[PDB]
Amino acid sequence: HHMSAIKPDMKINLRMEGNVNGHHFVIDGDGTGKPFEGKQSMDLEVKEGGPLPFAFDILTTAFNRVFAEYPDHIQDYFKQSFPKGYSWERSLTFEDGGICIARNDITMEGDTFYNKVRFHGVNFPANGPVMQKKTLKWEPSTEKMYVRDGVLTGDITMALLLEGNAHYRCDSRTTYKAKEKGVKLPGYHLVDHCIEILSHDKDYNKVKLYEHAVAHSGLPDN
Amino acid sequence: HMSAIKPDMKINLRMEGNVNGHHFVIDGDGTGKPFEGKQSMDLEVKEGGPLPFAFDILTTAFNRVFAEYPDHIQDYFKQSFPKGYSWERSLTFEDGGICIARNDITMEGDTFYNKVRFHGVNFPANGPVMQKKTLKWEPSTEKMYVRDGVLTGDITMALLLEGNAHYRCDSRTTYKAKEKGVKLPGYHLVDHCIEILSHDKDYNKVKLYEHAVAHSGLPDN
Amino acid sequence: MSAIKPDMKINLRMEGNVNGHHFVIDGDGTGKPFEGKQSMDLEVKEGGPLPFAFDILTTAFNRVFAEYPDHIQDYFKQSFPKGYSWERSLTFEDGGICIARNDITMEGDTFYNKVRFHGVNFPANGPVMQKKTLKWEPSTEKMYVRDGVLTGDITMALLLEGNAHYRCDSRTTYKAKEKGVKLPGYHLVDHCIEILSHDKDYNKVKLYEHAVAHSGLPDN
Amino acid sequence: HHMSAIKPDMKINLRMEGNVNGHHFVIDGDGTGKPFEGKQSMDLEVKEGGPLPFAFDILTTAFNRVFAEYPDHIQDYFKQSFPKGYSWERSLTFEDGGICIARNDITMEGDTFYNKVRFHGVNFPANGPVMQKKTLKWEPSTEKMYVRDGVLTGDITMALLLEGNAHYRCDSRTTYKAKEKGVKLPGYHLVDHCIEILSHDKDYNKVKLYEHAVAHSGLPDN
């Protein structure tokens, strides 16, 4: 199904304000993406709070499931949420007690998605891999999409690659809510994810981010 | 140390936050007795009223200075003044609801000043929080310990619900004094009891009360 | 003619498996139920010496030994002479997870305990497999009813060498054998457990626990 | 590093003893599988404790990652652990407080894998979907494989489909340990899973189980 006001190529405008371990920051983002191919890119710039005293990687998943390749046999809740848009809320529970919450209100004007992003993280240990900037990248992940109390819900077993090829686990819970009433909820399905920083300066004040996402029903069909 | 904390202190508090996309602003003015571990506060919602969620989830964000510390336990919080301290908190409810909170506590004369932030996400629409089915926080015991050079408190909390059911919440708080060299305490326990004394129908005005006592657990209590 | 006596004996036998290592431990002790105090002499019969820290087993070695005030229902003393049983999960912060069961019966002045203990996923470099634990810190068990079953959740912490701590979350469900035992309201149970003495390999251990129920501040 | 001694067609012999909510049970298993194709089937029969008073589905993932299709660019820790074999330990954390632990000692003799399985579950609510037997199936899952404390570890975001098209979440952590020294540890990778009860009698005293598993590196390389 389609009926989408979404174009094969869309612009992305993003502004994130947040606070991690008492450090405030504001980050602007501008990029493009192909929603029906599940890919998007963005140029990020730290406007306030730079250089960040924590690992930039923890913010990257907050920098839109519209950019996910959905097959025909799986309801695309996110592309059906427009032109009105949708919003999501997220909790990030790291294995060393660090906990983050995030929210994003996504709207659309013409060919541009607008993202109002907030990010708050607490209880990160001073000598943990986040505050010591020992993270290398997010590993590829698979988000489990299901309905809980009438709201589409995604749980992810995530892992940050660390120096020395160790890993730093993080459990993600996201709730997605369309702004329009009556948007049909999808059945249980999986969404493969891979997010990557293509380039960045030394202090991570400027970052180029990329993500590729594909929805599927899992084995043994797809 | 020459006692910068007085037996009777005033409390000024200002909380800004967002729970389930709903922004709110709450002002607070109250008094307390730090050496007796008791405090009261009059809360008034300035923005976002009436709140569409249970007011009880905010109450523990509305200062461990107001905790009776015995002589045999280091009082990290009373030693953090006049400069003050700050804490960060995470609240993990059993139905997926997760809250984070911060508070920057300063002191000017006989008044504590509190800059509080509160953010909650993923609360189910039919859960006891969004349906406002909570009655009170049950009495709790905070477990104080040092982790990575930071005093940490873990609490097994439970909200009493309508229908005499309970609603579990796990709390972890990290306390950090602003002055360098403040002596960290050993392992100890802090009993807590928080209670809404009165409120209007929409909880736009709330009178809150807390009593806290630190101890070493059995059999030293 | 109460089934609970002021001074009662305790007979216990634990069989278990931690990280693939099987063990059998016998226990014999005494206790004062109304004072909430008990002691026990433990002896490893199989699997000795234990390759893991003995402290993780100690809470598996009976809430009858808890001083209950009048204003709090004593579910555990009401469960006898027939007895009760509990199941327990121990979730340690480094991924180690333990489950435990205990079927408690009574004959005369003696409680009988059929205890099982199973643990998995303890890291080889963790404080349990390195035996770096010193003691359990004093804890407070949160008692409440969930789906008609009395449940206790505890924020526990093991003191380690170097004055560090090692966190463990405990949930216990208590079920009386007899139907119609009155369920208590919400209350707290302070705990303090201690190994009084032990030989070098912990093949013989003297264990002690004191427990007191209360309603928290400001009523207790 | 060495020859796996694994054949394209293997027999499977399994014996599980366990205890869930105070109920003891013994279940025997006999089936076949194709290790290089990542597929296996098994006929289960309850020898003791029948009929089971709990949902049979909670036991099915305890009924061997040898039966997983591994590409050449990913180290196959499990096929390389034979002929000597390996063992795994697992914890199952359900969202309503029910917690299970499980272990399996896997050896090999000729064309037959031997499995010594143990399973213990506690704190399942009496009115929960497990004790009321309201589960339908495991949804397709993706196991995240990584090295933790020198041990290959798999974390999975699992979900049981319930009657009423609701879902019942479960977090799984498995540690895999080869019996032989010198087995090369793999890098981070994903293992898609799909497990299904093909047939069963009314009391689940006899159950036909099937699993298909494929290892991969995630998007966009796999």
Side-chain angles (χ1 to χ4, degrees), chain A residues 3-185:
Chain A
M3 75 164 290
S4 56
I6 306 175
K7 308 174 180 301
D9 294 280
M10 298 288 294
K11 300 179 183 181
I12 310 167
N13 181 271
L14 184 144
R15 160 150 277 182
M16 168 192 287
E17 302 185 14
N19 184 313
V20 176
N21 265 32
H23 185 89
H24 180 70
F25 56 91
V26 175
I27 305 174
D28 291 345
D30 289 276
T32 57
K34 289 174 179 296
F36 304 95
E37 299 185 17
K39 306 173 182 179
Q40 59 172 328
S41 59
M42 189 181 305
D43 292 311
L44 300 162
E45 183 181 341
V46 176
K47 294 305 186 64
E48 297 181 18
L52 298 180
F54 56 92
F56 198 95
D57 283 325
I58 71 170
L59 311 169
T60 56
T61 71
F63 298 119
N64 188 6
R65 209 69 59 255
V66 163
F67 300 101
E69 182 185 346
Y70 267 84
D72 294 339
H73 68 279
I74 301 180
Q75 164 76 5
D76 195 331
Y77 184 82
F78 308 96
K79 292 191 178 65
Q80 293 295 308
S81 301
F82 285 89
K84 291 182 181 177
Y86 77 101
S87 63
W88 57 258
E89 298 189 325
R90 207 177 281 172
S91 72
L92 300 179
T93 303
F94 298 88
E95 57 173 301
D96 63 346
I99 290 184
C100 299
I101 65 97
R103 48 172 57 94
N104 182 14
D105 296 279
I106 307 178
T107 56
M108 190 194 70
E109 262 109 72
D111 62 336
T112 300
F113 292 113
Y114 291 87
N115 304 262
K116 176 184 175 183
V117 184
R118 296 296 178 265
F119 193 103
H120 295 274
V122 297
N123 293 346
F124 279 108
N127 297 287
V130 169
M131 300 307 299
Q132 295 299 324
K133 299 175 187 174
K134 296 300 182 179
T135 66
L136 297 182
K137 67 167 186 177
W138 287 107
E139 293 281 10
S141 69
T142 302
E143 180 173 19
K144 277 70 184 184
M145 293 292 200
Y146 66 100
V147 174
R148 173 58 60 88
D149 199 14
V151 176
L152 178 61
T153 303
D155 294 337
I156 325 182
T157 294
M158 304 193 305
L160 280 163
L161 178 65
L162 307 184
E163 300 182 5
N165 290 332
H167 284 91
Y168 176 57
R169 279 274 289 99
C170 173
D171 288 340
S172 178
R173 160 84 72 92
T174 316
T175 55
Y176 308 96
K177 300 180 182 180
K179 284 177 221 264
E180 190 183 21
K181 192 69 179 64
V183 181
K184 183 175 177 59
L185 291 165

Side-chain angles (χ1 to χ4, degrees), chain C residues 17 19-20 87-89 91 95 97 99 101 118-121 123 125 147 171 173 175, chain D residues 19-22 89-91 97 99 101 103 120-123 125-127 149 173 175:
Chain C
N17 185 313
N19 269 31
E87 302 188 325
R88 210 178 271 169
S89 69
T91 303
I97 291 184
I99 69 101
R101 296 187 183 93
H118 297 271
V120 297
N121 296 342
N125 66 319
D147 196 18
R171 163 164 290 183
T173 54
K175 298 181 185 177
Chain D
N19 188 314
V20 176
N21 266 32
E89 303 188 327
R90 182 173 305 162
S91 64
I99 292 186
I101 67 100
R103 51 176 59 95
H120 296 274
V122 297
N123 295 341
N127 295 320
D149 300 312
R173 163 160 287 181
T175 56

Side-chain angles (χ1 to χ4, degrees), chain B residues 135-217:
Chain B
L135 293 181
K136 65 168 184 175
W137 286 106
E138 293 281 11
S140 63
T141 302
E142 183 170 22
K143 311 304 173 68
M144 295 291 198
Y145 65 99
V146 174
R147 173 57 61 87
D148 199 14
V150 174
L151 179 60
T152 308
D154 295 341
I155 322 178
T156 294
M157 307 190 302
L159 277 163
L160 175 65
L161 305 184
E162 302 178 6
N164 68 267
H166 285 89
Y167 178 54
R168 280 274 290 100
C169 176
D170 286 346
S171 177
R172 164 164 291 184
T173 313
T174 53
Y175 306 93
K176 298 179 178 176
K178 266 171 285 184
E179 189 179 23
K180 191 179 184 182
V182 180
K183 179 178 176 60
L184 291 166
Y187 195 97
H188 63 277
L189 294 74
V190 180
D191 290 340
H192 282 280
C193 64
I194 188 169
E195 171 182 2
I196 296 185
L197 296 179
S198 62
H199 64 81
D200 49 12
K201 185 178 182 180
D202 292 329
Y203 286 81
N204 292 321
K205 300 178 185 177
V206 175
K207 179 183 292 294
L208 192 63
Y209 173 83
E210 188 217 353
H211 181 198
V213 175
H215 62 97
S216 310

Side-chain angles (χ1 to χ4, degrees), chain C:
Chain C
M1 60 169 296
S2 174
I4 302 298
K5 297 86 188 175
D7 296 281
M8 300 193 62
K9 300 179 182 179
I10 309 165
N11 182 270
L12 184 148
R13 167 139 174 166
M14 168 190 290
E15 303 186 15
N17 185 313
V18 174
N19 269 31
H21 183 90
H22 179 72
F23 56 92
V24 174
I25 304 176
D26 288 344
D28 181 35
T30 63
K32 298 173 177 295
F34 300 105
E35 301 182 17
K37 300 176 180 178
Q38 61 175 318
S39 64
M40 186 180 306
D41 293 315
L42 300 163
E43 181 182 336
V44 179
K45 296 299 183 177
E46 298 181 19
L50 298 179
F52 53 89
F54 200 94
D55 284 325
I56 71 171
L57 309 170
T58 60
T59 71
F61 296 118
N62 190 0
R63 210 68 57 254
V64 167
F65 299 96
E67 180 181 352
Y68 266 83
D70 294 341
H71 66 280
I72 302 182
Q73 162 70 7
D74 194 330
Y75 184 82
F76 308 96
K77 294 188 174 65
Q78 289 297 309
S79 299
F80 286 87
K82 291 181 182 175
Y84 75 102
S85 301
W86 56 258
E87 302 188 325
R88 210 178 271 169
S89 69
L90 300 178
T91 303
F92 296 87
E93 59 174 308
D94 62 344
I97 291 184
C98 297
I99 69 101
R101 296 187 183 93
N102 185 13
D103 295 280
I104 307 179
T105 58
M106 193 198 70
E107 279 182 305
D109 65 337
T110 301
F111 295 110
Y112 293 88
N113 301 260
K114 174 186 173 183
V115 185
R116 297 294 180 264
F117 192 101
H118 297 271
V120 297
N121 296 342
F122 278 109
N125 66 319
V128 172
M129 293 303 161
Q130 293 298 315
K131 299 175 185 175
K132 295 180 180 180
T133 69
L134 293 177
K135 66 167 183 175
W136 286 105
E137 294 283 8
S139 60
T140 300
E141 182 170 21
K142 309 304 175 67
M143 294 290 199
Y144 66 100
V145 175
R146 173 58 61 89
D147 196 18
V149 175
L150 177 60
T151 307
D153 294 339
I154 323 177
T155 292
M156 303 192 303
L158 279 162
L159 174 64
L160 304 182
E161 299 176 10
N163 289 332
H165 284 89
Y166 177 53
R167 281 275 290 100
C168 176
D169 286 340
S170 175
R171 163 164 290 183
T172 316
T173 54
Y174 309 89
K175 298 181 185 177
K177 272 107 174 295
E178 187 184 26
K179 203 63 178 64
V181 179
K182 180 169 170 291
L183 289 167
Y186 198 100
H187 65 274
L188 295 74
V189 176
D190 290 338
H191 282 276
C192 66
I193 188 170
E194 173 183 359
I195 292 182
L196 301 175
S197 64
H198 65 83
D199 55 11
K200 190 175 182 179
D201 291 326
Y202 286 81
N203 290 321
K204 294 182 181 179
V205 174
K206 182 182 291 294
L207 189 63
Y208 172 82
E209 190 218 352
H210 181 197
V212 175
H214 61 99
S215 306
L217 285 181
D219 190 70
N220 286 137

